[PDB]
């Protein structure tokens, strides 16, 4: 079976050759393709891309920050990777609740999408509605009922937990490799607390794009050959999604190609 | 280039061979696969499947019913294809507004997702947020902030309008062929009023499934060879999405295989 990373490399190849010029919110240029999808197995392996070193430390630290529901930039940077407003954390754990300040107590306030996902999995694994959404805080004050930026749908079968992430837009060079590892990690965590085995991570995109200044570095990354994906290990029995600590995870067998900076 | 219908036929083939047994809400069995996607060109052709006759009349009549925002089953059946509650029409044109009865006047009440999509297209075609969502009315009273059933994301580039439909679950035998034609039709309509050319229709699914009692009829449909897709024509200059009438559309060159009944 072909290495899973070949889909990403293949997608990059496709955007460079068939992508259309399209400007983003700031008028910055990109090569764009609408509609994309890739599937990464999470069975006995973790999809942390190898044709470049992915900032795993930042992935793990940021995800844990989101799970805490924190809206304090300091609580993240301090980890080595400031009121930020209603960010993903607040939306994931306090969806619907009005945001005051990073100090306010929002216990029992708003919908806990994350805990709901976990609960639905253990009360009805066949459910076709195990969905969690996230918004770009920027859009919130912009209009009535703004469309989400991303949605995660979970699926269970044969004691296996899969996850599909749909993003209305995807920065193929910087964002995608990081997000693949981020959500693959979330799937690993939820599976661990619900007693299931990770299955597949499916990444779907609306506007999949490459920023003009990333083209050359990507053309070079494309010349690199993927190495066997590493493995992720949870060396501790955790029962609550909130009890996970950075030291609970261990990436093994990760020997990627050199870091590639993307402007 | 291979006929677009081969993706559908290929997807059906994949579910029969690799699908996993999974029960739906009513305990009815299906063969299931999580994560699927297909792309159908809308350029000089319309994706009305040919390996079986699709109920085009029902597609066109139902879509027009949704655009009116109607919640009266009679207004639909009467066409030849009863308060139904907050159905897709009401959500598409009066999102957020509380539903009273199919007679109530909801003018200016709720968010008009459909008109908003059209407006955003003509005021900022590069926008990555041209999204429209729909819910299963059934889920509304079920919980706080229920997850949508489907979301449509529009995309514009080179005077071409594309659409990606994401559904958390897809009935591969009955629902999918009908929905492909439904949203392809919606894209054709919106493109027509916004002065753009239809581009691509991308169909993405979470739980893509085949109901057990559809397996044999599909195994037979799989033995059939696709015929060139037909063409859709709008023989009238329309300016308002609400001004479209069934007689404005004409499917040409549609010679499908015989109807296939799916229980």
Curated annotation (Swiss-Prot), chains A, B:
SUPFAM superfamilies listed in its UniProt record: Thymidylate synthase/dCMP hydroxymethylase
PROSITE patterns associated with the record: THYMIDYLATE_SYNTHASE (PS00091)
Class of the enzyme per the UniProt entry, highest EC level: transferase
GO biological process: DNA biosynthetic process; dTMP biosynthetic process; dTTP biosynthetic process; methylation; negative regulation of translation; tetrahydrofolate interconversion
EC number: 2.1.1.45
Pathway info: Pyrimidine metabolism; dTTP biosynthesis
Similarity field: Belongs to the thymidylate synthase family.
Classification via NCBIfam families: PRK01827.1-3, thym_sym
Reported function: Catalyzes the reductive methylation of 2'-deoxyuridine 5'-monophosphate (dUMP) to thymidine 5'-monophosphate (dTMP), using the cosubstrate, 5,10- methylenetetrahydrofolate (CH2H4folate) as a 1-carbon donor and reductant and contributes to the de novo mitochondrial thymidylate biosynthesis pathway.
Protein name: Thymidylate synthase
